[PDB]
Enzyme design. Structure first.
Site, PDB file in Angstrom:
ATOM      1  N   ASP D  48      25.653  41.447   1.365  1.00 59.44           N
ATOM      2  CA  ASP D  48      25.845  40.015   1.294  1.00 59.44           C
ATOM      3  C   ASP D  48      26.007  39.712  -0.175  1.00 59.44           C
ATOM      4  O   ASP D  48      25.029  39.771  -0.927  1.00 59.44           O
ATOM      5  CB  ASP D  48      24.614  39.296   1.840  1.00 59.44           C
ATOM      6  CG  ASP D  48      24.756  37.788   1.804  1.00 59.44           C
ATOM      7  OD1 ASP D  48      24.643  37.188   0.715  1.00 59.44           O
ATOM      8  OD2 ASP D  48      24.989  37.186   2.872  1.00 59.44           O
ATOM      9  N   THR D  81      30.110  33.721   0.440  1.00 59.71           N
ATOM     10  CA  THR D  81      29.582  34.051  -0.847  1.00 59.71           C
ATOM     11  C   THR D  81      30.489  34.950  -1.670  1.00 59.71           C
ATOM     12  O   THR D  81      30.913  34.572  -2.757  1.00 59.71           O
ATOM     13  CB  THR D  81      28.180  34.657  -0.740  1.00 59.71           C
ATOM     14  OG1 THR D  81      27.611  34.610  -2.060  1.00 59.71           O
ATOM     15  CG2 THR D  81      28.174  36.136  -0.044  1.00 59.71           C
ATOM     16  N   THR D  82      30.798  36.129  -1.152  1.00 62.97           N
ATOM     17  CA  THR D  82      31.662  37.084  -1.854  1.00 62.97           C
ATOM     18  C   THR D  82      33.056  36.508  -2.136  1.00 62.97           C
ATOM     19  O   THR D  82      33.625  36.731  -3.207  1.00 62.97           O
ATOM     20  CB  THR D  82      31.806  38.412  -1.028  1.00 62.97           C
ATOM     21  OG1 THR D  82      32.069  38.096   0.338  1.00 62.97           O
ATOM     22  CG2 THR D  82      30.532  39.193  -1.018  1.00 62.97           C
ATOM     23  N   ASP D 377      22.794  33.830   7.177  1.00 64.24           N
ATOM     24  CA  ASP D 377      24.222  33.512   7.110  1.00 64.24           C
ATOM     25  C   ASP D 377      24.656  32.881   8.424  1.00 64.24           C
ATOM     26  O   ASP D 377      25.415  31.915   8.426  1.00 64.24           O
ATOM     27  CB  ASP D 377      25.055  34.772   6.846  1.00 64.24           C
ATOM     28  CG  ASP D 377      24.966  35.237   5.415  1.00 64.24           C
ATOM     29  OD1 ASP D 377      25.614  34.611   4.559  1.00 64.24           O
ATOM     30  OD2 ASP D 377      24.244  36.220   5.149  1.00 64.24           O
TER      31      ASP D 377
HETATM   32  N1  LIG Z   1      36.450  39.743  12.045  1.00 63.48           N
HETATM   33  C1  LIG Z   1      37.173  39.753  10.928  1.00 63.48           C
HETATM   34  N2  LIG Z   1      38.445  40.185  10.920  1.00 63.48           N
HETATM   35  C2  LIG Z   1      39.273  39.835   9.849  1.00 63.48           C
HETATM   36  N3  LIG Z   1      38.710  39.031   8.848  1.00 63.48           N
HETATM   37  C3  LIG Z   1      37.418  38.674   8.897  1.00 63.48           C
HETATM   38  C4  LIG Z   1      36.652  39.085   9.912  1.00 63.48           C
HETATM   39  N4  LIG Z   1      35.381  38.736   9.713  1.00 63.48           N
HETATM   40  C5  LIG Z   1      35.290  38.035   8.415  1.00 63.48           C
HETATM   41  N5  LIG Z   1      36.722  37.881   8.086  1.00 63.48           N
HETATM   42  C6  LIG Z   1      37.234  37.183   6.885  1.00 63.48           C
HETATM   43  O1  LIG Z   1      36.699  37.782   5.694  1.00 63.48           O
HETATM   44  C7  LIG Z   1      35.991  36.779   4.950  1.00 63.48           C
HETATM   45  C8  LIG Z   1      34.505  36.890   5.310  1.00 63.48           C
HETATM   46  O2  LIG Z   1      33.963  38.149   4.890  1.00 63.48           O
HETATM   47  P1  LIG Z   1      32.450  38.431   4.398  1.00 63.48           P
HETATM   48  O3  LIG Z   1      32.385  39.886   4.124  1.00 63.48           O
HETATM   49  O4  LIG Z   1      31.614  37.870   5.473  1.00 63.48           O
HETATM   50  O5  LIG Z   1      32.377  37.610   3.013  1.00 63.48           O
HETATM   51  P2  LIG Z   1      31.353  36.373   2.834  1.00 63.48           P
HETATM   52  O6  LIG Z   1      30.151  36.975   2.219  1.00 63.48           O
HETATM   53  O7  LIG Z   1      32.124  35.432   1.996  1.00 63.48           O
HETATM   54  O8  LIG Z   1      31.156  35.947   4.234  1.00 63.48           O
HETATM   55  C9  LIG Z   1      36.629  35.470   5.385  1.00 63.48           C
HETATM   56  O9  LIG Z   1      37.897  35.301   4.732  1.00 63.48           O
HETATM   57  C10 LIG Z   1      36.861  35.709   6.865  1.00 63.48           C
HETATM   58  O10 LIG Z   1      38.025  34.953   7.231  1.00 63.48           O
HETATM   59  F1  BEF Z   2      29.068  38.207   3.552  1.00 61.31           F
HETATM   60 BE1  BEF Z   2      28.700  36.822   3.441  1.00 61.31          BE
HETATM   61  F2  BEF Z   2      27.654  36.437   2.574  1.00 61.31           F
HETATM   62  F3  BEF Z   2      28.267  36.242   4.767  1.00 61.31           F
HETATM   63 MG   LIG Z   3      30.050  35.808   5.900  1.00 62.47          MG
END
Ligand SMILES: Nc1ncnc2c1ncn2[C@@H]1O[C@H](COP(=O)(O)OP(=O)(O)O)[C@@H](O)[C@H]1O
Ligand code: BEF
Ligand SMILES: [Mg+2]
Ligand SMILES: Nc1ncnc2c1ncn2[C@@H]1O[C@H](COP(=O)(O)OP(=O)(O)O)[C@@H](O)[C@H]1O
Ligand SMILES: Nc1ncnc2c1ncn2[C@@H]1O[C@H](COP(=O)(O)OP(=O)(O)O)[C@@H](O)[C@H]1O
Ligand code: BEF
Ligand code: BEF
Ligand code: BEF
Ligand code: BEF
Ligand SMILES: [Mg+2]
Ligand SMILES: [Mg+2]
Lengths: 523, 91, 531, 509, 80, 157
Positions: D48, D81-82, D377
């Site tokens: 995360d 977040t990322t 989250d």
């Molecule tokens: N199931 C998935 N398939 C393709 N893209 C995804 C999927 N799950 C998350 N995403 C995309 O990737 C990003 C979320 O990734 P994540 O690793 O959760 O980062 P964050 O910490 O910002 O949530 C968003 O742009 C979301 O649209």
């Molecule tokens: F990966 Be994120 F912070 F949900």
């Molecule tokens: Mg996320």
């Protein structure tokens, strides 16, 4: 250049047994073994151990040497542990636990050499041990009639005192068997034999009093009491003075009257408390607690011999001399609480004044004192170590048939060699080896007695052997020609002792073989 | 983690040009007094220990050591002046 | 990329390390696995020798610095902290698991595929367990079966002959506190008093409760035969004013009058009890215990009336004693009824030189025993306790979970095979995800192999035997449990030998090891920043 | 010392760009775990974003500003977040050239970026569709979306459940907006062991504190709860309370009084006929006794946070002084009072067979922290929707839409003011790209196709994670709270705008 | 509370900064005599933070601004 | 606390490109590029380089500045090499080799960003280069009549 692998912990030292560790340990043990192997027996020698705080110590005993040393080898600490069992849970036989536990592990490597498993040697050793306790229960020749008759006591304590302090072996055991009888009723507590000592002359002047001696002085002008039977005595947990209040307690004064009067006011109030008890016949009050100023003053007038004895462990063993009872408060000394003392005077011993608390017949005592005289403080201490060794062995002959007894001088041991081997080539399988070794092990007790006696062991050993195969009294002639006879001198190790030892040595020696890896850490 | 010169100073920018000017001004203001008929004179005791006293602006600017690149050209043009001409070096 | 300081194993180097370490920790604890394990003797920086063969012991007893070695340690401790058993198994499982997985990572397969496989296999493993287990009737009073559970989880750390000494002492204890008719139990009600002197083979089982703090007074009862027992908890010693106070006598003996005035608050509450030992058995057919103190003067009063008075008792003994005797835990003395004392038969204070040892023998409704561990030294007294606990929480688990599992790695060699031929004709998995479940499957063979690796007989060979003597009773139908005989080198029936793995352990061992390993494999960078 | 000029600018940009570089392999469904080592001791095995960047001290000022971005963003929405970090970087980076190469002043590049942000935000709400914050099924398949890309996915469904079952539980509309204080009313409780599924969302609280006295109720059927501040022991005077006694039998007098006041106190409590008395402070042994026979079980020492959550699932309003103890301060609406002993550790429950206590179980104290954060989250994106029922095309779709509508507009703007605007567009594209990369497919290939398909054929078309092919969102769906797409772009463009205001960096307080 | 605010929270609700209830020789915060008239007192949240607002008042006229930015670095300066 | 693996050589520093190395290098080059980017042209400026033995030097030329500096970045030494080719094998155009070689690698990362392979960018660059030499052979306007007539020389120098 050379790499290094599989490390993620911190900086330790792991001695895997698959690296010939069992033997590295046999070594460490082998070293401290030689120290005890020459301390056992009357022909034993002493060692001067010099404290890690710098104090001299000289002792024949084994559990004491080891105690005063800074052992460090884990496999060694284990056998030093067994020497503790022996000193606590028996007081005597401390030396024999070492010599065997070690010798066991010594003739143990001979087996490990062949290929005998660890677990196989263990099993065979226990099998040989349990078997060894059986014979001892029946190898037993005489048994003291539990007579407890003073003279019967001297037959037991004498062989324990020799081979610790051999030379005054009788002047000693006699000196203790006389302290024990004075407290043993007519149809045991080791504490009831407090021992004192003071530089001057030699041991020939040592004594046995029917009560303890104290160093401090009688406190009041009351120097020393009279020489006519009976003396009413009163002991106190409370201090002789106007009690106080645990929460503050300050004298207040609103008017001059309060003052002028408070002055002499408390003056006589103390007299009051003193008076009334002096009245009930008392004339000697031992003060475990403090003693006020005015307090003693009045008592001085009532010829009340005082004796501050803060030692709550001394005061308690004191009451059991006269008969009195410690009184928590002050004022109600029931004629029952009081006790009787035949003598409570002040004698100079070795030049310095000390107060006594004995009795010459009337009012028997349950706490006697052995006053040892000597010139070298050092030696004088190792003696009090022998006095304990004997006492420990007496308190052990009690209640559950402790009188049982087998031949000393290793005579028993020699028999035990053959007898354990009997079981040896009798049990099938490869265990037969370890069981036979367990038997060889018992050759240390004899051999060393001869070795320490300047006798050519290669001569005394076979001699003492063929002389054992009716007559299993033949032991080692401490002093000559071949061997000698146990019976020829009324000398033998009682069962209770020598048996419990063999069991502790077999544990120690066995746990050492169960460890098949060691880990240490920086200190 | 990598580098490109091994700890070896080097300045740039617009200030860089201004530093250099002022630098030269120093070596300049130094000789300004030795000018004119009623001109002041200098007494340099170089790290050499040789003590000198003169007005040949060249001789002064030669005894000042001077290491600043920029300001060191004032030492050069002063030397040439004492060559192709022989006088005016101060100026 | 970076900022000064702060190191970080990255790419496949980070995974290389993680697996490296795990494999390592694994090998270091493999030795103390199985009844045919190895007894290590580790000493600290003070010289405190201590023996062991319990992974947990050896594990929390060492100073580890490998990050991966911690996450694996902590998850292993978190296991002995729930199932109380199998701390060793779990470190091997996460170790061997990473090795088996690293093989397919090393060939190319993305770790996320080996983790996917793991979860899939995990579920299937936990399904298979519920079908593999053996529902044992809640019917306790089957001390025979339970004595096999005692020995099972005991030979894993005991001197052999001593196993037979402790096997009952543990079971009877668990039972003694367990409340029949399903219900539940709280092991805390099994005091584990331990005392030096006389080897750890001499330890004993007390149906009552043994304690230290004896009656500290000369004229006290050496042995109160047949009597009441008062559960006390109010301060029976001198006290002070909760608000700042002080005495101020103006008169010579006014002093004295104020002297007793302080103690009188004691006797006030102290009388309310002394007449109770009159108001009940005021003519002989008796003993107070009290969590708080009892000053001198007071001990007299009790010693005067021959009332064995104990002071400063282990506070959790309020509840333990309140079962050994029945009497209410009497907090205050005001509303103190004579019909609320407890009852014990022989209650004797065995004095062991300066050491006091009061026992609460003979009870009517025990419900709370005490396992008295004896032992010459401290190192043994240590390990013996760590053996009882790991084997007591072991029996009480056979009860909580009304199921049991055949030992000798039966369940492992089973699940292993199952998964192999399962997906071959299951395809109830995924694409290249078969790798991960294949690994997990092969992985499981840790326990059986390591089990014999310690014994001696060649792992590869003897395990091969089980694989044979097994399907033998499959090509002939019928169900036959098979395990590794760590004495011969052949297979055998775990159930017949008396070898059982507690159910809740296996359920929290697999789900556990996978949780770590599977989360370790998805690791791609080991940071070390933030001074 | 000092660094004016492009010197400054550059190091700032590179710094910021590097910040991204670290966690870029943590954005995506196949995102890896950055096991970080904290100074205090333990470790962090999370992926995360914000939870990583927190555990990394940085030096360069920009790298410090860039790092806190992940925090303020983790404060608005629980998610995204990322993404903000990666975007916040690429923006600065995509400006780098026109910043110096094309010698555009920082004022101008800022004037444009602030402009391009607003337009860009339009395109976000433009593609966002609303949602039934109440439809349990929609909320689940919404929460589920932001549970992927995390270790907690192997129980995805099970998670959204505990998520909704807790968001809604502590919720309390109120209108005279919706207030959901997940923080103070959803105390989590990670317990080592068991299975994941073996975890539930108890509607009450869970304290491990046992009972004040042995023979005391282990579980009252319908208990009457009484929560209080003040302790249960003899109090003292807040002045120079000093007692002087010379009146002999007066010691006993005062020493008694203490027992007396403890009595009174027990009375006032016992009065409203209670069965369960939970105080934040202590409980005098005496008071235990009078509350024993008074008929009630007692619990000493409980945190304010722990207590005030009890007072919402027992109704029992907490009260200080007892002589004022009202009867309205009941203990109604509170199921049992179980006291389950969980592996040699007693607990106490207060479920009812306004504030819940999510109790997680996994396979280690370590593994649980993964869950807790992962859960947070979930439970946060649930709250977001609750307060903004709008969602955005996941799979980086939204991100690409804004890339085009902006790219198009920029190209049709003309003036130096175009280049910086153009960059915001070019920038945005990095998210579908980071995704496609962390997928394994060819970035130049898939993007050109995603971008094209976008240019005309719908905008809810992003990239599929484990696959690597461009899919339409509506199809297999993975919308995310529109709120996330707000912040991610709001602050990222701000960050860039701040750092671009720097032309000089200096050292010393 | 911040005494530098109350001084202005009070001129803004017309209330009175009660130093100590006395007046001549008695004791009271004097019902609405010292009190202030405000339209509404609410505790609005702002992510992480959550403060109180005394919006709308008798004689307030007053205002108060609340910046929102990317982080503290820009924020300090925004206000700055 | 943090371990460390796969090391058995001696104490070196390996910058794997899979660690965004190509760009770390573009950086190092980017730095010395700016130095030459302002020395080219009549409107170029000089730089005073002060020798590692302490000698002043002022030059508009590029191959000379680089020569007198203590370059160390391997990826940079490479472009300083090309500035040698030019000075030896041509004496002139030393400055233009830098500015391009660098600028090539600059607009090169823009490609690496998208995903374009290393080998793909190489190939495309060579393809574009060989093509670029062709046009120059025909983009050629005049040609001195090889007159070598003194006045014709002054038109060139
Ligand atoms: N199931 C998935 N398939 C393709 N893209 C995804 C999927 N799950 C998350 N995403 C995309 O990737 C990003 C979320 O990734 P994540 O690793 O959760 O980062 P964050 O910490 O910002 O949530 C968003 O742009 C979301 O649209
Ligand atoms: F990966 Be994120 F912070 F949900
Ligand atoms: Mg996320
Ligand atoms: N008078 C003696 N003559 C021969 N052996 C004796 C004599 N007295 C005691 N011993 C031997 O002393 C041995 C024990 O050694 P000792 O030094 O007394 O150590 P411990 O008694 O502590 O074991 C016994 O085996 C006993 O046979
Ligand atoms: N005598 C036996 N023969 C075969 N397996 C046994 C035997 N006794 C117990 N085991 C095995 O011991 C294994 C556990 O090893 P142990 O040393 O108890 O470590 P832990 O229990 O801490 O994992 C169990 O898997 C069980 O199958
Ligand atoms: F040395 Be022993 F105790 F006689
Ligand atoms: F100083 Be000048 F040369 F006249
Ligand atoms: F060795 Be384990 F903890 F049973
Ligand atoms: F600098 Be170039 F050689 F004209
Ligand atoms: Mg002896
Ligand atoms: Mg086990």
């Amino acid at each position: 250049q050379n790499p290094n692998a599989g490390l993620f912990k911190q900086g330790y030292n792991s001695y895997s047994n698959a690296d010939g560790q069992i033997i590295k340990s046999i070594a460490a043990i082998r070293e401290l073994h030689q120290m005890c192997l020459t301390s056992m027996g009357p022909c034993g020698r002493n060692k001067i151990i010099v404290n890690h705080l710098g104090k001299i110590i000289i002792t024949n005993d084994a559990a004491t040497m080891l105690r005063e040393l800074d052992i460090v080898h884990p496999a060694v600490k284990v056998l030093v542990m067994a020497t503790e069992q022996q000193k606590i849970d028996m007081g005597d036989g401390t030396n024999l636990v070492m010599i065997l536990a070690g010798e066991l592990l010594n003739v143990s490597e001979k087996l490990i050499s062949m290929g005998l498993s660890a677990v196989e040697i263990i099993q065979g050793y226990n099998m040989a041990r349990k078997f060894t306790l059986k014979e001892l229960d029946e190898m037993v020749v005489g048994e003291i009639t539990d007579k407890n008759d003073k003279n019967e006591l001297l037959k037991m304590i004498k062989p324990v005192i020799s081979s610790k302090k051999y030379g005054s072996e009788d002047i000693l055991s006699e000196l203790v068997s006389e302290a024990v009888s004075h407290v043993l009723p007519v149809a045991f507590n080791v504490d009831s034999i407090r021992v004192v000592k003071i530089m001057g002359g030699s041991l020939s002047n040592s004594t046995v009093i029917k009560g303890m001696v104290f160093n401090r002085e009688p406190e009041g002008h009351v120097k020393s009491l009279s020489e006519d039977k009976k003396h009413k005595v009163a002991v106190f947990t409370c201090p002789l003075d106007i009690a106080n209040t645990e929460t503050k307690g300050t004298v207040l004064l609103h008017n001059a009257q309060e003052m002028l009067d408070f002055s002499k006011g408390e003056e006589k109030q103390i007299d009051a408390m003193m008076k009334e008890i002096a009245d009930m016949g008392v004339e000697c009050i031992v003060a475990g607690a403090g003693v006020g100023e005015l307090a003693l003053h009045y008592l001085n007038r009532y010829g009340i011999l005082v004796l501050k004895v803060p030692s709550k462990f001394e005061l308690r063993r004191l009451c059991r001399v006269c008969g009195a009872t410690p009184l928590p408060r002050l004022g109600a000394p029931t004629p029952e609480e009081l006790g009787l003392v035949e003598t409570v005077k002040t004698m100079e011993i070795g030049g310095d004044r000390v107060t006594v608390f004995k009795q010459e017949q009337g009012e028997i005592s349950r706490t006697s004192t052995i006053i040892l005289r000597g010139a070298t403080q050092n030696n004088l201490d190792d003696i009090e170590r022998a006095i304990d060794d004997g006492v420990a062995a007496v308190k052990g002959l009690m209640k559950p048939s402790g009188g049982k007894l087998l031949p000393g001088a290793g005579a028993t041991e020699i028999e035990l060699i053959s007898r354990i081997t009997k079981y040896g080539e009798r049990t099938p399988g490869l265990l037969q080896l370890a069981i036979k070794q367990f038997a060889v092990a018992f050759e240390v007790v004899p051999r060393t007695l001869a070795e320490t006696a300047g006798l050519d062991v290669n001569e005394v050993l076979p001699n003492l052997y063929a002389a054992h195969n009716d007559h299993l009294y033949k032991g080692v002639d401490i002093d000559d020609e071949g061997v000698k006879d146990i019976r020829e001198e009324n000398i033998y190790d009682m069962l209770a002792t020598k048996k419990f030892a063999i069991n502790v040595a077999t544990e120690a020696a066995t746990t050492v073989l169960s460890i098949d890896q060691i880990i240490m850490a920086k200190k | 983690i990598v580098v490109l010169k091994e700890g070896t100073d080097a300045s740039q920018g617009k200030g860089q040009i201004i530093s250099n000017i002022n630098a030269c001004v120093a070596v300049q203001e130094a000789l300004k007094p030795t000018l004119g008929p009623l001109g002041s004179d200098i007494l340099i005791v170089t790290s050499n220990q040789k003590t000198t006293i003169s007005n040949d602006g060249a001789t002064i600017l030669k005894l000042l050591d001077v290491v600043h690149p920029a300001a060191k050209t004032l030492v050069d043009i002063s030397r040439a002046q004492d060559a192709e001409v022989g006088d005016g070096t101060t100026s | 990329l970076l900022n000064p300081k702060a190191e970080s194993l990255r790419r496949d180097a980070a995974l290389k390390v993680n697996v490296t370490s795990a494999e390592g920790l694994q090998s270091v604890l493999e030795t103390n696995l199985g009844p045919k394990g190895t007894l290590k003797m580790l000493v600290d920086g003070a010289g405190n020798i201590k023996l062991t063969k319990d992974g947990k012991v050896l594990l929390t007893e060492m100073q580890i610095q490998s990050p991966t070695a911690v996450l694996i340690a902590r998850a292993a401790a978190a296991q002995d902290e729930i199932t109380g058993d199998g701390t060793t198994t779990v470190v091997c499982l996460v170790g061997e698991l990473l090795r088996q997985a690293h093989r397919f990572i090393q060939e190319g397969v993305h770790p996320r595929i080996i983790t996917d496989g793991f979860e899939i296999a995990r579920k299937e493993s936990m399904k298979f367990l519920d079908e593999f287990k053996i529902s044992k009737t809640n019917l306790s009073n089957d001390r025979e079966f339970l004595l096999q559970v005692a020995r099972s989880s005991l030979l894993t750390k005991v001197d052999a002959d001593l196993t037979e000494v402790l096997t009952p002492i543990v079971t009877d204890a668990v039972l003694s506190v367990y409340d029949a008719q399903a219900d539940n139990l709280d092991l805390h009600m099994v005091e584990i008093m331990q005392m030096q002197h006389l080897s750890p083979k001499d330890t004993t089982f007390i149906k009552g409760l043994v304690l230290d703090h004896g009656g500290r007074h000369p004229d006290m009862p050496t042995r109160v035969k047949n009597a009441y027992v008062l559960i006390l908890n109010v301060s029976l010693e001198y006290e002070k004013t909760e608000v700042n106070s002080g005495f101020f006598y103006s008169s010579a003996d006014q002093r004295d009058k104020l002297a007793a005035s302080e103690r009188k608050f004691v006797d006030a509450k102290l009388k309310k009890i002394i007449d109770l030992k009159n108001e009940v058995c005021g003519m002989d057919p008796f003993v107070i215990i009290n969590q708080k103190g009892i000053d001198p003067m007071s001990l007299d009063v009790f010693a005067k009336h021959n009332i064995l008075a104990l002071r400063r008792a282990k506070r959790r003994n309020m509840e333990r004693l309140q079962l050994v005797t029945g009497g209410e835990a009497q907090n205050s003395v005001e509303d103190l009824s004579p019909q609320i004392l407890g009852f014990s038969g022989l209650v004797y204070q065995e004095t062991i030189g300066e050491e006091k040892f009061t026992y609460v023998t003979e009870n009517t409704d025990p419900k709370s025993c005490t396992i008295l561990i004896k032992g010459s030294t401290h190192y043994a007294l240590a390990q013996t306790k760590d053996a009882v606990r790991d084997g007591l929480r072991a029996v009480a688990n056979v009860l909580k979970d009304k199921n049991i599992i055949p030992g000798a790695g039966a369940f492992y060699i089973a699940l292993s095979r199952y998964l192999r031929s399962a997906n071959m004709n299951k395809l109830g998995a995924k694409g290249k995800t078969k790798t991960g479940i294949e690994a997990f499957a092969e992985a499981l063979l840790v326990i059986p192999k390591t089990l014999v690796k310690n014994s001696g007989f060649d792992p590869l060979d003897v395990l091969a035997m089980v694989e044979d003597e097994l399907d033998d009773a499959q090509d002939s139908d019928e169900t036959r449990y098979v395990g590794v005989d760590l004495n011969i080198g052949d297979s055998c029936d775990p159930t017949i030998e008396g070898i059982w793995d507690s159910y809740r352990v296996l359920r929290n061992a697999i789900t556990g090891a996978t949780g770590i390993a599977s989360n370790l494999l998805l690791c791609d960078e080991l940071l070390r920043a933030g001074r | 010392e000092r660094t004016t000029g492009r010197q400054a600018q550059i190091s700032n940009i590179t710094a910021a760009k590097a910040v991204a570089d670290v966690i870029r392999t943590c954005l995506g469904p196949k995102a890896m775990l950055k096991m970080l080592l904290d100074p205090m001791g333990g470790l962090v095995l999370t992926n995360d974003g914000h939870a990583i960047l927190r555990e990394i001290d940085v030096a360069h000022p920009a790298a410090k500003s860039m790092l806190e971005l992940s925090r303020t963003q983790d404060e608005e929405v629980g998610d995204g977040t990322t993404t903000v970090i990666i975007l916040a970087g690429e923006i600065l980076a995509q400006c780098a050239p026109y910043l110096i190469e094309k010698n555009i002043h920082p004022v101008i590049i800022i004037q444009a970026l602030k402009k391009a942000l607003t337009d860009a935000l339009e395109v976000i709400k433009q593609v966002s569709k609303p949602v039934d914050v109440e439809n349990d099924a929609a909320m689940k398949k919404l929460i589920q979306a932001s549970i992927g890309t995390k270790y907690v996915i192997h129980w995805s469904e099970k998670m959204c459940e505990l998520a909704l079952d807790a968001v809604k539980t502590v919720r309390k509309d109120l209108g005279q907006n919706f207030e959901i204080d997940i923080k103070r009313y959803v105390r989590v409780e990670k317990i080592p062991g068991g299975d994941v599924l073996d975890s539930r969302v108890l509607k009450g609280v869970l304290l491990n504190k046992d009972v004040v006295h042995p023979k005391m109720s282990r579980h009252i059927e319908n208990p009457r709860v009484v929560l209080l501040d003040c302790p249960l022991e003899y109090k003292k005077g807040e002045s120079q309370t000093n007692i002087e006694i010379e009146k002999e039998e007066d010691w006993n007098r005062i020493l008694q009084i203490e027992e007396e006041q403890v009595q009174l106190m027990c009375e006032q409590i016992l009065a409203v006929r209670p069965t369960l008395v939970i105080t934040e402070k202590g409980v005098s042994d005496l008071a235990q006794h009078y509350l024993l026979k008074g008929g009630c079980s007692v619990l000493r020492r409980v945190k304010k946070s722990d207590n005030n959550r009890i007072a919402r699932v027992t109704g029992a309003t907490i009260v200080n002084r007892v002589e004022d103890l009202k009867e309205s301060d009941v203990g109604t609406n509170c199921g049992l009072f179980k006291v389950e002993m969980i592996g040699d550790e007693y607990f106490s429950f207060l479920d009812n067979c306004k504030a819940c206590t999510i109790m997680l179980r996994g396979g280690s104290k370590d593994i649980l922290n993964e869950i807790d954060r992962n859960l947070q989250d979930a439970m946060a994106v649930a709250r977001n929707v609750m307060l903004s029922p709008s969602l955005s095309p996941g799979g980086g779709a939204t991100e690409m839409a804004v890339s085009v509508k902006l790219a198009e507009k920029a190209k049709q703007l003309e003036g130096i003011q175009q280049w910086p605007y153009q960059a915001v567009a070019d920038a945005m594209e990095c998210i579908p790209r980071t995704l496609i990369q962390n997928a394994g497919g060819d970035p130049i290939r898939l993007l050109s196709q995603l971008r094209a398909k976008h240019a005309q054929g719908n905008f809810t078309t992003g990239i599929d994670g484990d696959k690597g092919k461009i899919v339409d969102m509506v199809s297999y769906g993975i919308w995310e709270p529109e709120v996330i797409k707000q912040q991610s772009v709001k602050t990222a463009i701000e960050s860039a705008c701040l750092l671009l205001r720097v032309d000089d960096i200096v050292s010393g307080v | 509370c911040k005494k530098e605010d109350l001084r202005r929270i009070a001129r803004a609700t017309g209330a009175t900064l009660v130093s100590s209830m006395s007046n001549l020789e008695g004791e009271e915060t004097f019902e609405s005599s010292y009190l202030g008239l405000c339209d509404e007192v609410v505790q609005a949240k702002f992510s992480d933070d959550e403060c109180i607002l005394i919006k709308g008042t008798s004689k307030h006229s007053s205002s108060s601004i609340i910046l929102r930015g990317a982080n503290d670095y820009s924020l300090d300066e925004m206000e700055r």
